[PDB]
Design a protein around this ligand. Sequence first.
Ligand SMILES: Nc1nc2c(ncn2[C@@H]2O[C@H](COP(=O)(O)OP(=O)(O)OP(=O)(O)O)[C@@H](O)[C@H]2O)c(=O)[nH]1
Ligand SMILES: CN[C@@H]1CCc2c(ccc(O)c2O)[C@H]1O
Ligand SMILES: [Mg+2]
Lengths: 292, 230, 52, 336
Amino acid sequence: TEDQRNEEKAQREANKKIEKQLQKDKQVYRATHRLLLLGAGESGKSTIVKQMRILHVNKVQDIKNNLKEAIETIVAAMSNLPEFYEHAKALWEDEVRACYERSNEYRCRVLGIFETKFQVDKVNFHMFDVRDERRKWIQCFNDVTAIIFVVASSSYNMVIREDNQTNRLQEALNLFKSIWNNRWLRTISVILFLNKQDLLAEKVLAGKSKIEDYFPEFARYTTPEDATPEPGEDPRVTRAKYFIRDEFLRISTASRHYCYPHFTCDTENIRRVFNDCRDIIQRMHLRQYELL
Amino acid sequence: GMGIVMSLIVLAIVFGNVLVIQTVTNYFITSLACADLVMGLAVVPFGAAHIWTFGNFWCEFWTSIDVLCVTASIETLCVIAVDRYFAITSPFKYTKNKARVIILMVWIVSGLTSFLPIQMHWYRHQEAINCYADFFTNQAYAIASSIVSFYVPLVIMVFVYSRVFQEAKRQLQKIDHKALKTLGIIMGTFTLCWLPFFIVNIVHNLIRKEVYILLNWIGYVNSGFNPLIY
Amino acid sequence: QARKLVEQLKMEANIDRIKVSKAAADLMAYCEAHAKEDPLLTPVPASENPFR
Amino acid sequence: ELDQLRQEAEQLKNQIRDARKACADATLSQITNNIDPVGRIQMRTRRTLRGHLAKIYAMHWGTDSRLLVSASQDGKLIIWDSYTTNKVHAIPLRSSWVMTCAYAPSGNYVACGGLDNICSIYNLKTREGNVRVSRELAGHTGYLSCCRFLDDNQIVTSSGDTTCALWDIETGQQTTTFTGHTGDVMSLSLAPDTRLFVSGACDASAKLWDVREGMCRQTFTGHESDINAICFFPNGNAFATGSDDATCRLFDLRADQELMTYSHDNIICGITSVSFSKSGRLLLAGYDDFNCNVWDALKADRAGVLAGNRVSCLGVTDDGMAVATGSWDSFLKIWN
Ligand SMILES: Nc1nc2c(ncn2[C@@H]2O[C@H](COP(=O)(O)OP(=O)(O)OP(=O)(O)O)[C@@H](O)[C@H]2O)c(=O)[nH]1
Ligand SMILES: CN[C@@H]1CCc2c(ccc(O)c2O)[C@H]1O
Ligand SMILES: [Mg+2]
């Protein structure tokens, strides 16, 4: 019984140590919260992470690579419609400006999961990051408390990388609808951002494109009665501003799920939206499972 | 002479608690169910003492059991309500080990102030001694038990449930019926079941002894509704 | 690039296609051969079972 | 012209289809219409296991048929012991996401996949105390879906980028690369001969590649939905397949024809995995409706049903005396 006794005792000791370690570790897993970003191409899902992680979390050669692609796009579309850098410097200076007006054609570049963790006085938050229309990886994220959806708002006229497919914003509306009705993600809350506020104000102010032109369904000319306009906001833009949000909410209100709209742009504004993210701690209070 | 007919009805109280008997908060319901089991089993024979005085220690046993069971159930309900308030009042809360300490502390503390004095000669005058050959009390021990078992938790329950109702209204308005009904079912049932007993006990002449036992029978009926309510 | 797929397809098709030749029987024969070996088909004795 | 060249392919395909049609002689049921049914059978949980904090995604039985390795959703591989229900190791993972597992035939290394496209390996019997990552491979895009060992120094991976590759751990580079699928590849299984391996794409198609040459040979297209699991018959001449719809089919390499389509009418859930038995008489399969069902190779009857959320993976010991099933309930069970 020499081999049996010593081996069994050592195995029991190892089991006890491992069980103690696992019990100690399992407490932190329940404590931490998880989020998950989504969105569309060129929406801005990952650029806010830079401003978000700057709050509490703690490439030069790669950046120049995207810079060259900037010069090629305008030159190539012209026909249809440091020696290299020194010549490009004159080209930047030489840049009629009608090429910029052709926005229909086609701060960081648009690039695996990049996980970011930041800690506060409250529980630290762990976030994820991400074409592929199959989306077969969506299963097995029922454990995430909230999904931070981000949608562009200044592109109601451009087109997706697949040219002449559909409206850039319309390509995001139907995608939200698909997320809304899913078997696995049937008990997850969704937060909406309406990014690129500054560009929208610049676009609408100087005439040119009209929402009624590209979107015929624009019967609502009067804003909702319970409207809290932004300080100094022009009445015309507010009707445009609330039009985007109401279109999303109609899909949300068609059918356990509670959607929250917002407005974001100014790193401190996102930081104010960060405190806004802290301010939205309603969902844990919200579940209220003991009927109440 | 239909007492036997109602006796089998009270026998059904044990079945529900037995069937009822997992989460951090769900461990507390075991304590409430356990107290009901003790009250259901012990009180049933002692309740049928009506045609009597089975033994000298028999009076000691019923006295040591009933007070312990009643105070344990009241304290357990108080603890459950406190935990329910604590869960939703403060998000980002800051344990099974803590729960085991909490449950053990409440039950042992309650029994100590009840079982020990009852067997430690806490009673009265010339009429009381003749009963030895009525659960008479003296030296304000009834007052202390009433203020430390059925009176004290009521204020805490009222405060915490008022806070919960205040928070619920705030949550509803932020969006721009059921809460009132559920809170009423949870609270008013216990209030209506237990307030008459404590009211009559403190009235201690002007109260008939025969009717007095009837109210204390109502409080024992509260055990049956305990499993179905939760 | 299409010619690459077509060339591969002809090579893949250039494979002998055997008849059934009682293919089920060959599958049946092996299954009938290892009837005793499988412990799930007929439960093992309690002493024989290493688990319990 | 590609279309002009495609005419020859279609005629050859028509030649392929007609010749494949010409191989039909009789159904499997007619040949198997004189067999004694296995009868009703049920199994009880001999051992239960616990200790995870999240869902289990995959597991692999050891060649010793005693130790099994399982991977959770928190990134914690733990090597168990079936006899004593006692853990042996708890290796934390650099990536919180894991989707596969593998156990070396020599019982030395454990390979773990992950949503991050890194097929990291581990060493279990080196020095003492802490275990250390041996090599990390990153020569692919997408997410991985399966990892098996040919030998102690060769691993086969199947990513989600319509690519199946063969790795060499010592050099950390792709020796070959197999392509041809038009969609994502979800699973594979090596052959008992350790010479061929088949992979089930997501486009209702299956293939049968060759390791040595590096080129495809056949293609079966019997289904109409996503394919989720594959397992070789012990004879090595056939392999079952589990699809998104409840139909499970058994094909055959020699006859190139699908033989038996296990018709399921009352069943409405989806398949998650399949696994055979030692004698090839039973075909285990888990479902998406929280329980499991056991089929027959030929008679096509529900021999038994095991219950105990969704099941995510199965397996059979090399000895054949036990069956293990995972789940998303953070608990793994044993059956016998
Ligand atoms: N003017 C302006 N540009 C913005 C704003 N937010 C984002 N952008 C730009 O949009 C880009 C979006 O890039 P990413 O964050 O990678 O998002 P994406 O392009 O949708 O791509 P993925 O994150 O890879 O899905 C940023 O790099 C910025 O250049 C904004 O508020 N104003
Ligand atoms: C015999 N009936 C007893 C008498 C005294 C008493 C009761 C209940 C709770 C108390 O704190 C008491 O002091 C009654 O159940
Ligand atoms: Mg990316």
